[PDB]
């Protein structure tokens, strides 16, 4: 369809 | 039900709860709403090294696809978890995986400006040139910061400085297969290999050469790594560059060969080495000067000439170039030996595959070669000829008085060597010429005892 | 440019 962002996130 | 509990534990990094919840039955379970992600997908994307470790031990699939076509490696790359990236690569996730739009993990990290992930991927053989379904590569979609990495031009000053300062781990921190043949912005415009070779970083050279460094790469003034190494007299690194296909008579813009550079700076031992790899001291430069001209010592001038004829003869002998042999011929040069192998020109002639090798052998003996000269492992030319079944030259060696029962390092004759190789006509002829079969080697073997059935047949008639 | 000594050193 159209591209989505992947699961997850940046650390700290 | 309790699948949702696991997937939440994977995001938070509750190792204890993942341990409690996960098993073979659900370790590769898809989140059947939303993204269709694996537990590893979530954990990787969230930078949970310990959860990832344990998931992988429980048989977590590192090539598992979500709905979009992604791989846990895609997820970790988007969010800059270079620790987790390195760990998934080690379990075999390929850094050129394609999602449904043909984005690779390198697209995903270049878009998000993740420099540590970009370099780790490139080191593990990621491809900057793979294009997505819109025809755009990783470099095309790159962040302005990550664009510098995918052109091989990132902390390039620091990379080059590491090479010339001999700093192994700080090089391997930055070294991608792209920034390996970069050039400096200014000065000599050298490559990493140029500097490492010039400053005698023997270990840095091994690493550069391994990772695809160009042995032919030219600097601003025409030079190549081998020029630098030879000028400053680094035998270690000179030999290593030659081993990897360096051109021994490579020419810069002024037509200086490496032997010019070495000879002018009285590098007696590098000159010696280069000559044996086919260096030509008679090659003139722009200023009409040979390597022999530029040699300061009178010992180096005569040694450059002596060693050059020597090798030039050995080479002619082994390609049985009869005309070439007749030219390069004084008594001093006939019995010239090869520094390493101790091979006279006669050893090279009798081992030639080329068709005039009988005549070269004949001529070399007429011109006064030592028919019983030993090579580094005590083999005469008769041994060399006999182990190859070059039987034609054995007539010539015999006529000029070769000892048929000359022993080698292991007490073996020529006949022992022929018998061992199964050379039946060689055995026959060696006996006709006079090889005693009953000679026992240092190991207790007659020629007969080393040979096959067919050899034994021949040797048991004496 | 004009000709240099090459990059590198003896010791």
SS3 labels along chain B: CHHHHHHHHHHHCCHHHHHHHCCCCCCCCCCCCCCCCCHHHHHHHCCCHHHHHHHHHCCCCCCCCCCCCCCHHHHHHHCCCHHHHHHHHHCCCCCCCCCCCCCCHHHHHHHCCCHHHHHHHHHCCCCCCCCCCCCCCCCCCCCHHHHHHCCCCCCHHHHHHHHHHCCHHHHHHHCCCCHHHCCCCCCCCCCHHHHHHHCCCHHHHHHHHHCCCCCCCCCCCCCCHHHHHHHCCCHHHHHHHHHCCCCCCCCCCCCCCHHHHHHHCCCHHHHHHHHHCCCCCCCCCCCCCCHHHHCCCHHHHHHHHHHHHHHHHHHHHHCCCHHHHHHCCCHHHHCCCCCCCCCCHHHHHHCCCCCCHHHHHHHHHHCCCCCCCCCCCCCCHHHHHHHHCCCHHHHHHHHCCCCCCCCCCCCCCHHHHHHHHCCHHHHHHHHHHCCCCCCCCCCCCCHHHHCCHHHHHHHCCC
Q: Closest to A7 (Cβ–Cβ): which among B37, B80, B108?
A: B37
Tokens of B150: 């995918």
Neighbours of chain B (3+ CB pairs under 8 A): A, C
Distance of CA B181 to the CA centre of its chain: 17
Give me the numbers of helices (H) and strands (E) for chain C, helices first please: 0, 0
- Contact A4/B103, CB-based, under 8 Å? no
Chain A residues with CB-CB distance to B80 below 8 A: 10-11
Q: Is B219 on the interface with C (CB under 8 A)?
A: yes
Helices B202-210 & B156-165, crossing angle to 10 degrees?
A: 130
Q: Closest to A11 (Cβ–Cβ): which among B35, B44, B47?
A: B47
Question: Closest Cα partner for B80 from B51, B110, B109, B49?
Answer: B109
> Which technique?
X-ray
Give the separation between CA B355 and CA B352, rounded to whole angstroms. Answer: 8
State the total domains in chain B. 1
Residue to test with chain C: of B184, B187, B188, most C Cβ within 10 A: B188
Tokens 């050059």 sit at which residue? B308
Would you say B285 and B260 are in contact if contact means Cβ atoms under 8 Å apart?
Answer: yes
Q: Do chains C and B touch (3 or more CB pairs under 8 A)?
A: yes
CA distance B297 to chain C (A): 19
Would you say B267 and B294 are in contact if contact means Cβ atoms under 8 Å apart?
Answer: no
B11, closest residue in chain A (CA to CA): A8
Tokens of B183: 């050039």
Tokens 């810069």 sit at which residue? B252
The reported resolution of this PDB entry, expressed in Å, is 3.2
Chain B residues with CB-CB distance to C3 below 8 A: 221, 253-254
Q: Do chains A and B touch (3 or more CB pairs under 8 A)?
A: yes
Give the separation between CA B162 and CA B169, rounded to whole angstroms. Answer: 9
Would you say B248 and B275 are in contact if contact means Cβ atoms under 8 Å apart?
Answer: no
Would you say B205 and B240 are in contact if contact means Cβ atoms under 8 Å apart?
Answer: yes
Give the separation between CA B39 and CA B26, rounded to whole angstroms. Answer: 9
Chain C residues with CB-CB distance to B234 below 8 A: 8
Would you say B365 and B396 are in contact if contact means Cβ atoms under 8 Å apart?
Answer: yes
Neighbours of chain A (3+ CB pairs under 8 A): B
Give the separation between CA B159 and CA B153, rounded to whole angstroms. Answer: 9
CA distances, B106 to each of B32, B98, B340, C10 (Å): 27, 10, 49, 42
Domain extent, residue B99, equals: 1-462
Residue to test with chain C: of B231, B264, B267, most C Cβ within 10 A: B231
Would you say B275 and B311 are in contact if contact means Cβ atoms under 8 Å apart?
Answer: yes
The residues near B418 (Cβ < 8 Å, ≥ 6 apart) are: B386, B387, B389, B426, B427, B430, B447
Would you say B107 and B129 are in contact if contact means Cβ atoms under 8 Å apart?
Answer: no
Give the separation between CA B128 and CA B103, rounded to whole angstroms. Answer: 11
Tokens 């694996």 sit at which residue? B38
Q: Do chains A and C touch (3 or more CB pairs under 8 A)?
A: no
- Contact B227/C6, CB-based, under 8 Å? yes
- Contact B76/A7, CB-based, under 8 Å? no
Tokens of B437: 């079969």
């Amino acid at each position: 369809g159209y591209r989505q962002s992947p699961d997850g996130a940046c650390s700290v | 039900g309790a699948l949702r509990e696991l997937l939440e534990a994977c995001r938070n990094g509750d190792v204890s709860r993942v341990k409690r919840l996960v098993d073979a039955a659900n370790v590769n379970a898809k989140d059947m709403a939303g993204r269709k992600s694996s537990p590893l997908h979530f954990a990787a994307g969230f930078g949970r090294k310990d959860v990832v470790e344990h998931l992988l031990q429980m048989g977590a699939n590192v090539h598992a696809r979500d709905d979009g076509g992604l791989i846990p490696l895609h997820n970790a790359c988007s969010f800059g978890h270079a620790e987790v990236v390195s760990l998934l690569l080690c379990q075999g996730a390929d850094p050129n995986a394609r999602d449904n739009w043909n984005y690779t993990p390198l697209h995903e990290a270049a878009i998000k400006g993740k420099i540590d992930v970009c370099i780790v991927l490139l080191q593990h053989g990621a491809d900057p040139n793979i294009r997505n379904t819109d025809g755009k590569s990783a470099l095309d979609l790159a962040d302005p910061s990550a664009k510098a990495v995918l052109t091989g031009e990132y902390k390039k000053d620091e990379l080059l400085e590491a090479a010339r300062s001999g700093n192994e781990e700080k090089l391997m921190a930055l070294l991608t297969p792209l920034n390996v043949n970069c050039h400096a912005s200014d000065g000599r415009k050298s490559t990493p290999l140029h500097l490492a070779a010039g400053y005698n970083r023997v270990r840095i050279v091994q690493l550069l050469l391994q990772h695809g460094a160009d042995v032919h790469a030219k600097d601003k003034g025409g030079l190549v790594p081998l020029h630098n190494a030879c000028s400053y007299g680094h035998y270690e690194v000179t030999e290593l560059l030659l081993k990897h296909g360096a051109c021994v008579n490579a020419m810069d813009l002024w037509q200086f060969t490496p032997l010019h550079e070495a000879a002018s700076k009285n590098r007696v031992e590098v000159c010696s080495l280069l000559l044996s790899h086919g260096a030509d001291p008679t090659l003139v430069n722009c200023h009409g000067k040979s390597a022999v001209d530029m040699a300061p010592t009178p010992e180096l001038r005569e040694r450059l000439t002596y060693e050059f004829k020597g090798h030039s003869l050995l080479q002619a002998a082994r390609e049985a170039d009869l005309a070439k042999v007749k030219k390069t011929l004084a008594l001093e040069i006939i019995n010239f030996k090869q520094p390493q192998s101790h091979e006279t020109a006669l050893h090279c002639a009798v081992a030639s595959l080329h068709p005039k090798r009988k005549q070269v052998t004949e001529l070399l003996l007429r011109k006064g070669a030592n028919v019983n000269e030993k090579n580094k492992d005590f083999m005469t030319p008769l041994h060399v000829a006999a182990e190859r079944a070059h039987n034609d030259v054995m007539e010539v060696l015999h006529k000029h008085g070769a000892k048929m029962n000359a022993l080698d390092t292991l007490g073996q004759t020529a006949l022992h060597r022929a018998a061992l190789a199964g050379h039946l006509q060689t055995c026959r002829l060696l006996l006709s010429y006079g090889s005693d079969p009953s000679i026992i080697s240092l190991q207790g073997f007659t020629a007969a005892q080393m040979g096959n059935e067919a050899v034994q047949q021949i040797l048991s008639e004496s």
